[PDB]
């Protein structure tokens, strides 16, 4: 079932039938929706030409997770900004046809003498349907690469506009970008979908949003809804009072009246609008999502005390104020809260909205995190949302030890034909489950042992020992400094003494 | 010079009694000058209240009006929280049981059925509800304060 084949025939059927209701319920629409929901959205390839430090490069992305590792000034943030540029145009076209996106800044072009223009290319694969978008800008070159090729993305935008125009409560892809410091339409909730960029360490705003949402949720539980539950408070009672205690023809006659009352009570529920993610349903779903992300807590609730009000979290047998949390936990709290907020609103039809599709970009995930937190963030992220594609850049070797070797890319700098250009390599071993220093050495190509001055005497003493010159006066003099700095019981000294004894025994045997 | 021995001595008594009493009361002092005409005629969210908040100034002007609005909504939410929870459970049990009796009396249909048992259950629920009341015994002291 190709997307194009279903799309063309549905368009023809829509053109043939003037009546909207005739085509509203038909096999063509069901076929299109069914084949659309099974497709998995994910980017496939990207190419960069004359953008910032990058001269010419092509990158292939995985389907579930991809981690970029490198030093400073190696274009890690360039790749993420390129993808954000590509996705901006698609978002603008989805919102409205023929809408400008984000242009390339003039200062972002390479400063080399012979450069003329900068181009960005991308490929989006949806099951079998494929598309490609190229955006280019020339600073001063006489010849340019014509204009941006937006033909491929307009067909996809029109597909989404068509599907969501006829059938409501549809689904849309998720695009988010958690950047670095730098610096109608479901607006009732106050969440803003217009801005792709979002910033962490804004716990105050999310705290106020949660409080206001809770107040609206509590308000909706009263008034007319309290009347409907009151009716249900008697129909079920009548059912029990007529069929439980008197089991042991006028008695049976009341059962008809009770069933009539139940059917009449069904009239009020019949005259009720769809939930459409009302205030009540959003709150519990968000709270349960956060509880699922962090299983160390029992429950979270807002308590209005005799004079104050605060949010209380319970773990084990201790209750902690929300403000007592450290900076790392606050950052995790707001990151997961924002992700859950977007996912719930974008998928109002699914029973479990945590199974949506989209792409999420995170830059410097290990910011403001203790080493004990860094060793479990990836597993939880990849387990809470199992149908999202992640692109992550990191600096900490502790995170690398929890990532499979098939999702690691290393950026280096090599010179070919007199021109220095970036290059992408892969680790040569398996780095999942290895120690911290093994991961640093293999996944980052750095010396795990410092080159301090105090180390300088250590290798000299070792070398003198290995050359069977440990009895020399120079070795005796150097041992005083080493033993003074480290101490007798340090394991490094212990192994040196073991080597001394082994060599002494070998010399004794050889002498005899 | 000024003579401030009397005020210092009197205020020391109030501070001492406030030290050993959980919720000791304090006298009320206020002044509504002629500038109040546009006080009603014409920031970081507050979460903690105290009786010393009213002692910052002796006069009424400007931001006091704003604080009244922020205090009023705080009272309303406090009532709403107490309107839910276990108080709703007694609401459901007592009303339905009473309705079960009333319809039967109205119905007059036909061991005397289970009317006596239902009345006994209603009496037990009413006794438990009355015993559960604490403080002012009318939804604690939140709904009554707001009303
Ligand atoms: N106009 C330009 N021409 C050439 N090189 C440029 C230009 N502008 C920036 N650069 C290069 O960009 C490099 C830094 O790029 P970038 O910001 O991607 O680095 P990063 O370390 O990955 O970033 P971050 O810390 O934000 O993740 C610098 O080393 C600089 O040489």
CB atoms within 10 A of CB B147: 8
Q: Across the strands, what pairs with A176?
A: A360
Which residue's C-alpha comes closest to atom 9 of ligand 1? A52
CB atoms within 10 A of CB A335: 20
Q: Which of A219-223's residues contact partners 24+ apart within 8 Å by CB, and which partners?
A: A219/A279, A219/B80, A220/A278, A220/A279, A220/A280, A221/A280, A221/B84, A222/B80, A222/B83
Resolution (A): 3.1
Rounded-to-integer distance, Cα A100 and Cα A90, Å = 10
Rounded-to-integer distance, Cα A199 and Cα A437, Å = 32
Rounded-to-integer distance, Cα A363 and Cα A179, Å = 6
Chain B residue with minimum CA distance to A239: B100
B95–A230 C-beta distance less than 8 A:
yes
Q: Which of A201-208's residues contact partners 24+ apart within 8 Å by CB, and which partners?
A: A201/A327, A201/A330, A201/A331, A201/A334, A201/A368, A202/A334, A203/A330, A203/A333, A203/A334, A206/A333, A206/A334, A206/A337, A206/A338, A207/A311, A207/A322, A208/B45
Rounded-to-integer distance, Cα A211 and Cα B74, Å = 12
Residue A336 burial by CB count (10 A; 0-12/13-18/19+): exposed, middle or buried?
A: buried
Interface of A with B in 159-218 (CB under 8 A): 208, 215, 218
Helical spans, DSSP H, in A271-326? 279-293
Rounded-to-integer distance, Cα A134 and Cα A144, Å = 13
Rounded-to-integer distance, Cα A245 and Cα A115, Å = 91
Chain A residue with minimum CA distance to B118: A241
Rounded-to-integer distance, Cα A378 and Cα A390, Å = 10
Compute CA distances A188 → A96, A209, A212, A278, B29, whole Å.
21, 12, 12, 10, 44
Closest ligand 1 atom, CA of A107? 1
Compute CA distances A512 → A466, A503, A508, whole Å.
21, 14, 6
Q: Interhelix angle for A279-293 vs A377-384, to 10°? A: 140
Chain B residue with minimum CA distance to A237: B96
Q: How far is the CA of A73 from the centre of ligand 1 (A)?
A: 5
A508: left (phi over 0), alpha (psi -120 to 50) or beta: alpha
How close B8 comes to chain A (CA, Å)?
Answer: 30
Pairing of strands A41-51, A174-178: unpaired
Pairing of strands A41-51, A54-60: antiparallel
Read out DSSP for A201-228?
--HHHHHHHHHHHHHHHHHHTSTHHHHH
Sheet holding A358-363, edge to edge: A197-198, A174-178, A358-363, A388-393, A65-69, A408-416, A419-425
- CB neighbours of A245 closer than 8 A, spacing ≥ 6? B114
Cross-chain CB nearest to A250 (options B78, B99, B109): B109
Please answer whether residues B41 and B13 qualify as being in contact, where contact means their C-beta atoms are separated by less than 8 angstroms.
no
Please list every protein residue whose CB sits less than 6 Å from any atom of ligand 1.
Answer: A 52-53, 72-78, 110-111, 180
The CA-CA-CA angle for residues A69, A73, A78, to 5°, reads 75
A234–B96 C-beta distance less than 8 A:
yes
Experimental method: cryo-EM
Please answer whether residues A137 and A109 qualify as being in contact, where contact means their C-beta atoms are separated by less than 8 angstroms.
yes
Cross-chain CB nearest to B84 (options A215, A221, A230): A221
- The DSSP 8-state label assigned to residue B133 in this structure reads -
**Tokens 């990151």 sit at which residue?**
A335
CB atoms within 10 A of CB B42: 7
């Amino acid at each position: 079932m190709n997307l194009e084949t279903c799309y063309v025939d549905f368009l023809e059927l829509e053109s043939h039938v003037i009546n909207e209701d005739y085509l509203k319920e038909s096999v063509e629409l069901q076929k299109l929706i069914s084949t659309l929901n099974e497709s998995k959205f994910h980017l496939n390839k990207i190419g960069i030409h004359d953008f910032k430090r990058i001269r010419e490069l092509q990158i292939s992305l995985e389907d579930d997770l991809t981690v970029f590792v490198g030093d400073n000034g190696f274009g890690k943030s360039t790749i993420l900004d390129a993808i954000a540029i590509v996705l901006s145009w698609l978002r603008s076209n989805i919102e409205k046809e023929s809408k400008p996106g984000t242009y390339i800044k003039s200062h972002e072009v390479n400063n080399s003498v012979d450069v003329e223009y900068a181009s960005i290319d991308a490929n989006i694969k949806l099951k079998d349907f494929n598309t490609s978008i190229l955006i280019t800008k020339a600073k001063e070159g006489a010849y340019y690469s014509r204009n941006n090729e937006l033909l491929g993305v307009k067909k996809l935008a029109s597909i989404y506009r068509l599907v969501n125009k006829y059938v409501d409560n549809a689904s849309l892809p998720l695009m988010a970008y958690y950047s670095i410091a730098r610096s109608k339409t479901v607006w009732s909730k106050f969440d803003v979908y217009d801005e792709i960029e979002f910033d962490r360490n804004d716990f105050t705003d999310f705290f106020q949003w949660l409080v206001f949402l809770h107040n609206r949720a509590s308000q909706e539980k009263l008034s007319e809804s309290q009347t409907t539950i009151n009716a249900l408070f008697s129909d079920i009672q009548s059912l029990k009072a007529t069929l439980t205690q008197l089991s042991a023809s006028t008695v049976i006659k009341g059962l008809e009246l009770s069933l009539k009352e139940k059917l009449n009570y069904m009239k009020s529920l019949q005259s009720g609008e769809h939930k459409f993610n009302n205030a009540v349903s959003l709150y519990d779903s968000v709270i349960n999502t956060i509880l699922k992300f962090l299983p160390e807590f029992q429950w979270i609730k807002l308590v209005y005390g005799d004079d104050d009000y605060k949010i209380i979290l319970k773990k084990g047998e201790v209750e902690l104020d929300i403000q007592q949390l450290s900076q790392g936990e606050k950052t995790i709290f707001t990151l997961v809260g924002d992700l859950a907020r977007r996912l719930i609103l974008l998928n109002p039809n699914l029973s479990n909205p945590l199974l949506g599709y989209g792409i999420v970009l995170i830059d410097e995930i290990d910011l403001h995190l203790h080493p004990q937190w860094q060793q479990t963030i990836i597993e939880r992220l990849t387990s809470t949302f199992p149908n999202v594609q992640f692109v992550i850049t990191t600096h900490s070797p502790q995170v690398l030890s929890t990532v499979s070797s098939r999702s690691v890319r290393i950026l280096q700098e090599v010179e070919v034909d007199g021109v220095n250009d970036l290059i992408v390599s892969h680790p040569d071993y398996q780095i999942k489950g290895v120690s911290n220093q093994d991961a640093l050495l293999y996944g980052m190509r750095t010396d795990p042992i410092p080159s301090t001055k105090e180390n300088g005497w250590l290798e000299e003493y070792k070398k003198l020992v290995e050359l069977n010159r440990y009895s020399s006066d120079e070795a005796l003099l150097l041992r005083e400094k080493v033993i003074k700095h480290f101490g007798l019981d340090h394991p490094l000294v212990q192994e040196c003494d073991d080597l001394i004894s082994v060599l002494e025994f070998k010399n004794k045997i050889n002498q005899h | 010079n000024n003579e401030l021995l009397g005020v210092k001595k009197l205020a020391s008594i109030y501070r001492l009694v406030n030290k050993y009493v959980d919720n000791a009361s304090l006298p009320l002092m206020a002044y509504y000058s002629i500038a109040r005409s546009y006080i009603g005629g014409g920031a970081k969210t507050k979460t903690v209240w105290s009786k010393f908040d009213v002692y910052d100034e002796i006069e009424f002007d400007r931001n006091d009006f704003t604080d009244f609005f922020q205090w009023l909504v705080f009272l309303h939410n406090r009532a709403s929280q107490e309107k839910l929870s276990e108080s709703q459970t007694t609401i459901n049990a007592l009303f339905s049981d009473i309705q079960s009796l009333k319809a039967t009396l109205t119905q007059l249909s036909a061991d005397s059925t289970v009317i006596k048992g239902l009345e006994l259950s209603l009496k037990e629920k009413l006794n438990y509800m009355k015993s559960l009341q604490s403080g002012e015994h009318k939804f604690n002291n939140a709904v009554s304060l707001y009303d």
